[PDB]
Amino acid sequence: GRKLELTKADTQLTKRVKNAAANVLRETWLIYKNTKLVKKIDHAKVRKHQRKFLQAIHQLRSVKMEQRKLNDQANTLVDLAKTQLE
């Protein structure tokens, strides 16, 4: 039997991914431009885009964590169904 083995590992989430990912591109570019393509660095501009960059990166981390959570919930139900194979 299966003994101790277990299963091997949304429109709203997709929209959260596309908006956050576009903002990572936006802010990576604006930090790069304001730190490497200007004659004089405007630190207020850099702080602003660093705040927007960290928020977009952390939003993508949040979606990925929620997808991992959803995947394990689905695997929990699949594992329960697989007890009937015994």
Binding site: L4, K8, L70, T76, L85
Partner: protein
């Protein structure tokens, strides 16, 4: 792909989810089942669980959507590392050992518990060297072999 016997056994499995026996699994029934397994999915997570399996978009999971779904996740993997990690929780000094006394303290007080007698049978198998200490990596390897 699924065999005749697996299709039959998964019909029995469908009854673990379809609580009222009306032929469909709702978010409400999935919530009850998940909570009976000590999980706490939010409403959106329950809806997501239904929506990923609900091919016709009627808001519930029927037996063919349930079966079709089981076919995609038949692959299993060994649990050795995860089980070892669960023993590591009780390895106070992080030395790879749990004493026979600490194993009794844990097993007779935490979770569902074992009787002192069941603990005796577990320790007899776990303590390979008869030194009153359990090398839990070795014990888990033995049970998953």
């Amino acid at each position: 792909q699924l065999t005749e016997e697996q299709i039959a056994e998964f019909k029995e499995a469908f009854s673990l989810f379809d609580k009222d026996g009306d032929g469909t699994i709702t978010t409400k029934e999935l919530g009850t089942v998940m909570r009976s397994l000590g999980q706490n999915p939010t409403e959106a997570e329950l809806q997501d669980m239904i929506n990923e399996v609900d091919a016709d978009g009627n808001g519930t999971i029927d037996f063919p959507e349930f079966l079709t779904m089981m076919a995609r996740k038949m692959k299993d993997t060994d649990s050795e590392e995860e089980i070892r990690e669960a023993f590591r929780v009780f390895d106070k000094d992080g030395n790879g050992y749990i004493s026979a006394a600490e194993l009794r303290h844990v097993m007779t007080n935490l979770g569902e518990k074992l009787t002192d007698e069941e603990v005796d049978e577990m320790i007899r198998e776990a303590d390979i060297d008869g030194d009153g200490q359990v090398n839990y990596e070795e014990f888990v390897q033995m049970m998953t072999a």
